[model samples]
Target: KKIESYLDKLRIKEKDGEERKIYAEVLDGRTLKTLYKLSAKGYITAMGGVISTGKEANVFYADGVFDGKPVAMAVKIYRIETSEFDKMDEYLYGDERFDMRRISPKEKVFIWTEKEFRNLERAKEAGVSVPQPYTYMKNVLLMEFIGEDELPAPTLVELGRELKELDVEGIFNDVVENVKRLYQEAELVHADLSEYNIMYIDKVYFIDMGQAVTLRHPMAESYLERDVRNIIRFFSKYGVKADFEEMLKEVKG
Candidate 1:
């Protein structure tokens, strides 16, 4: 398949039985078949780089043909077995989006996937700078890759060279403005906001929407506060001054 060929170009030689088992479980039979289908159709080549490895999602870069040009794109693969499915269910239960409850394991997984897919849609509608959603199936989600080269863009916290380009205040303002837009414009709160989850593409691309929920979720207010707090704490170390309470007051007003 084209996947193997792409991997071959990337110099990823196959290993032993353990590796096969890992792939088999992570990509279920249905997902494996789909990946193969995508490969056969010449859509995506090889998946590369663990851009953001979080509690429930792992983002990767995959080679592909976009607009007839060879390019790499990002894919957010939601990890199933090790993920917090119950927590996912809790937030999803009250949402008006889906009628998902008391279902089988497979059915529950379907709900989680649907929840994230919908969240991405909302973010896009709200003008959030997330990667364009191309496809979502089972636990795997495909989106336009966010980086220029082999490396995915660095997270806001790990932006080494970019830091030098920006004065301390510039970085601080960037974070603050992002938080405000994300909360005010996009009615969805990033419940798990932190340095680790924010990626700096040309602009910032928020990764791991798995935990994100509409503002109507039970813990929405608290999550908003915490999200601001996390950004405040990170920027403080860079000497970009901002108070959590002050920022919260301004944002909510």
Candidate 2:
């Protein structure tokens, strides 16, 4: 009863001009069962308002007790029925970690959620700045909330508009260095990195690692180049300069 009431209080409407109730629209019976299991395990005590709503998954802020202390957690729930599963299946196809034969769309969503959790762990282990992943079950993922109080962190694109002079240069260097770490140390390429996927708090953090691929992947180099190009293009607006080829070589090293 308490948990249901808490969820009702934190309920959020879809922000994309849709009038449908979020829970009824996207959260299936399976997702509700998973949430209930997590609640019973004390992994989440209370659900909070939405942190973000996107095409594939919706992120929510939640409160929980960890080690007898209250903590904040980011909960990500992927939509199995409505998400672009065919396109997502493409990302899963070439990964050596998964067996992709004749899997259902539901199975694809589960694997994608698990893939993101593993990717975040690998990224953190390699010393890259990403949301610290805690756990995942089926379509649900819980991770460290990268914000203060009830507010989510601003994206790099949002911060860039408000930033001036030295702050811009500092963040520019920070992003490039993190990208280098993601490449050389993590040995993975962030296939969809751009301003939108990066969050700005005190530092720039790489989020959304579901599409990241190992160096052994067929398109890893091309993906790396695209990531570099995207980052450089975004930074150039703030007067940061680096040759694309030189940046690529440096990151590869």
The candidate scoring highest on lDDT is 2
In candidate 2, what are the lDDT values of residues 1-253, reduced to their tens digit? Answer: 3443333432233433343255555567778778877878878877766678887899888887666667889999997765554656766646777776656755778988998999999999988999988889989998889889878888888777675644887887788888899888888888788999899888889988887887877788888899889988998887878799898887887
Error of 2 at 46 (Å): 0.4
Give the deviation of candidate 2 from the true structure as CA RMSD: 4.3
| Shift in Å, residue 19, candidate 1 | 8.6
TM-score of each predicted structure versus truth: 0.78, 0.87
**What RMSD value applies to candidate 1?**
4.8
Cα lDDT, model 1, residue 147: 68
Instruction: Please report how far candidate 2 places residue 27 from its true position, in Å.
Output: 1.5
Q: Please give, for residues 13-72, the per-residue lDDT of candidate 1 as tens digits.
A: 243466444454455455565566665666677755456656566665677765566767
Q: List the pairs of residues colliding in candidate 1.
A: 73-145, 74-145
